[PDB]
Design a protein around this ligand. Structure first.
Ligand SMILES: Nc1ncnc2c1ncn2[C@@H]1O[C@H](COP(=O)(O)OP(=O)(O)OP(O)(O)=S)[C@@H](O)[C@H]1O
Ligand SMILES: Nc1ncnc2c1ncn2[C@@H]1O[C@H](COP(=O)(O)OP(=O)(O)OP(O)(O)=S)[C@@H](O)[C@H]1O
Lengths: 292, 217, 293, 219
């Protein structure tokens, strides 16, 4: 680690020679890396909210008319035993008696009970709904296994379009970080025409030319990722302050999950490696034009 | 031992800069090759180090032939030639002290003997007070001087010259020529290529002249 | 226009000097213009998607019994001339609302009053509309069921403000991103040469003359920058136009995705080429200020 | 007339290039200024075009004062000086044909005059063969020849020669000197600067020798 001292030494004064351009080329590239972090913040907080808050795929299932006053407990006990629906909300015949009198007064008697069916997210497909309709109907004492759909048809269709457009935006941003690193590094290299010629005409090794440009690209990507993380964290705090007054009408305390430590290391290492390969592609495709 | 036979050069436009030249070159002996303005002397002068391929023919260097070889072999043997140029290929961003320290850090010397080697390679040129500064405020009379100061580093086996004394006085030409003359005490060749006729008339060495890239004037 | 032909010739010679480098510069400046366009059509289609939505702002306009239908037409003219944003529908309580009485006579089992729904436009909304409407409401007889619904009304006011702040923040960071990326591209494009600025002034010239093929080069880079985005955004639109079909039929209607009309395309080209008129102008004079004696 | 007051110049590095230079530079005749390597024989020519400011005194040109020009007229007055360089500066990645036609564009040339002006300029140096190529494939002698060729155009009122024939042989040295020497029948002042004496000793014009910025000898 003694011959690599000079390669790390030269890039520091190379960047510090013109400080405003060095600041500008990191400020332009952190705000290009702000948006994958912002989209990742937007993605991962609505996903944990999607576990409990909005989706509740209940299917209104009616029991037999006057089979028994406590026949729903047997349905709960038998539906606990199979896959798919595990937890069943206990709604007996006396539950429907107390649950249907208020609706009549709000709008203006056998009364079979209404069961609660939750297929979670592994059997939420409409093609997989009919598989769950087979086991409920084949159990005796159940008359109406009536569909609801409507809102559930919209819930099972718009999520595909939102996932597809988010995947398209994510692919376009991973192409953007794949390309703006290479653009910035290759303009930094093509700003220097004399140096490669001087260290190549003088007897050397190709790795000696390769090392300082590669280290400069690596530290440029490192600085861009660090400034991107610092600029994203204050926006996460600003949005936490923006959602603090919105979450108090939802009835529960809500907070935004920030940039975790296990992914920031991955972001820094992929920015270092993309600076590595950007400087490799910028320098190898530049010193092949100096060998006649 | 540098051996020549019929070698030519036609880069892109078919301009026959060279067509063939044949001379042996003993180790330690000096030379003063020259020509006219359009004469192909600098291309021949670069064929020894061989940063371009010599097209037809082949060039023998020491005990090897380097005609069309790989890029993992040519810059290893490029460290033994004293590359100076007419145009000033110098690092404009970096200062003078590490312009001449490039062969030192390629050779991988320790950091303590860099300073005495550079000062030993600059006191005979005569530039220590005008060191540790940038070449953009150095005029050509010392820019050409610090250009050749990296050629005298680490005692190359063969030393090359691409028109020195272009921006120097005749007294400084004589001083820099006596700087070049003391290298002939050891086994390194001198390959001066100057247009000056009174400087080479004051001494007798191996004088050859190429006339428009063919044969020997 | 005889003196400006050398500027166009030098600009096209610079662009044709390194076709791969200039193509990569056009690609990096064009991939930045994709997201203002994408966010603009996303913000645009939700405006016509705000014509219909599931949480409709229902107003409890439950009037009296039997004789309320005769007085319903008398009172609808006074309230519509009060604020001007008032849409009231009326149905027959005895005949047309018998299905609403039969709603309780279903599998999920004339005392109920008449049902009327008032949905105003989004231009006249907020607490001020409620303050100007509840002062004269229930002005006839006694009116049962005065209990409004405002749980969805409060949340839609909160949710649209949040995504409005998010969209405003996204838009200002996009204009910052495009401004800095054209500044970075043009600045490194002119910093890639050093002698071409020096030699033009060491030989006596005009200060405006050296500005011509750099301002025109930046303007042509900005003008060619937006066109590649305007032949790439609609490609992604038609790639994502297939998924609109199966989610439109579940809405009970047919919805068409809007595109980039020619009124805003010229605006986007003008704002993307005008920043080449500024970035080159500042960067060249910053570069030549460092070479003046 | 071109007049000098008691002027000098140093830099930020502490090197005093000039320590007092005064001469009356008459219109029409030649000059053969020379000195040692550390002398200010090039920075004297750099002050004529006004691309550096003198540290001391005041500087005069033609019939006007070229001191304190706020970057709006020293673009204008520099155009009549074909100030040659020591090391060659050419517009790289640009052909020779419009490289010497650079000062004609600013001056307002027509379409027809550019061709014959470039042709007549390159006749005097004799390079109507490497005319449409780039200066990458030009060797150093013709690089110096096209560098000195672009000073010839626009017919400048004052000509400066900051070391020509440094990359030329003795046969073409007399020709490139006589290209300057034919300018005596027109009203142009030529400042030739060189190191060697052999072609200077074959002629007889004004000697302006300097030692560390002091002329002493040479009126
Ligand atoms: N890369 C090149 N491509 C084409 N022609 C070239 C190239 N390099 C040199 N030449 C030609 O080589 C000829 C002269 O070669 P040189 O030996 O360089 O001449 P010279 O006498 O050395 O001039 P200088 O100033 O001393 S380099 C000229 O006709 C040039 O056009
Ligand atoms: N821009 C500058 N900044 C600082 N010092 C300078 C500058 N230009 C020249 N010098 C110094 O001034 C002295 C000679 O100046 P110059 O006139 O440029 O040299 P010269 O006339 O070119 O002599 P040459 O190169 O042998 S023809 C040297 O000590 C230089 O280091």
């Amino acid at each position: 680690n003694e011959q690599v001292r000079y390669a790390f030494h030269g890039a520091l004064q190379d960047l510090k020679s013109k400080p405003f351009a060095t600041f500008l080329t990191v400020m332009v590239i952190a705000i290009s890396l702000t948006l994958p972090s912002v989209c990742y913040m937007v993605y991962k907080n609505v996903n944990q909210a999607a576990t409990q808050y909005y989706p509740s795929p209940q299917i209104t299932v009616y029991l037999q008319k006057t089979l028994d006053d406590d026949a729903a407990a047997g349905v709960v006990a038998q539906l606990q035993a199979e896959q798919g629906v595990e937890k069943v909300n206990y709604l007996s015949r006396e539950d429907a008696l107390g649950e249907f009198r208020n609706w009549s007064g709000f709008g203006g008697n056998p009364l079979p009970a209404v069961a609660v069916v939750i297929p979670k997210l592994d059997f939420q497909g409409t093609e997989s709904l009919n598989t769950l309709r087979d086991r409920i109907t084949q159990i005796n004492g159940i008359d109406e296994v009536r569909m609801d759909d409507s809102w559930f048809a919209r819930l099972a269709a718009l999520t595909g379009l939102v996932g597809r457009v988010s995947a398209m935006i994510g692919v376009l941003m991973v192409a953007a970080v794949f390309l703006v690193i290479g653009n910035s590094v290759r303009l930094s290299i093509f700003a220097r025409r004399d140096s490669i010629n001087v260290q190549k005409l003088i007897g050397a090794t190709d790795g000696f030319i390769l090392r300082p440009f590669l280290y400069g690209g690596a530290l440029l990507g490192f600085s861009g990722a660090l400034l991107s993380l610092i600029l994203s964290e204050i926006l996460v705090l600003r949005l936490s302050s923006a959602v603090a007054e919105v979450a108090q009408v939802f009835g529960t305390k809500f907070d935004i999950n920030g940039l975790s430590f296990d992914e920031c290391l991955l972001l820094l290492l992929v920015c270092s490696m993309i600076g590595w390969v950007a400087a490799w592609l910028a320098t190898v495709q530049h010193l092949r034009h100096f060998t006649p | 031992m540098i051996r020549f036979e019929h070698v030519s050069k036609a880069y892109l436009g078919g301009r026959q800069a060279l067509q063939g030249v044949t001379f042996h070159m003993q180790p330690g002996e000096m030379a003063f090759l020259t020509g006219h303005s359009g004469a192909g002397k600098s291309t021949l002068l670069k064929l020894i180090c061989g940063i371009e391929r010599p097209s037809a023919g082949k060039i023998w260097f020491s005990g090897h032939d380097i005609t069309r070889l790989k890029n993992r072999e040519v810059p290893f043997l490029r460290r033994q030639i004293g590359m100076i140029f007419q145009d000033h290929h110098l690092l404009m961003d970096r200062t003078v002290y590490d312009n001449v320290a490039i062969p030192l850090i390629i050779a991988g010397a320790s950091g303590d003997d860099i300073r005495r080697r550079v000062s030993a390679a600059l006191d005979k040129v005569g530039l220590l007070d005008k060191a540790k500064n940038f070449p953009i405020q150095l005029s050509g009379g010392e820019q050409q001087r610090v250009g050749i100061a990296r050629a005298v580093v680490n005692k190359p086996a063969v030393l090359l010259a691409d028109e020195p004394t272009g921006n120097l006085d005749d007294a400084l030409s004589e001083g820099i020529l006596r700087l070049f003359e003391e290298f002939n005490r050891v086994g390194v060749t001198v390959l001066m290529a100057t247009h000056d006729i009174n400087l080479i008339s004051r001494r007798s060495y191996r004088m050859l002249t190429l006339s428009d890239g063919h044969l020997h004037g």
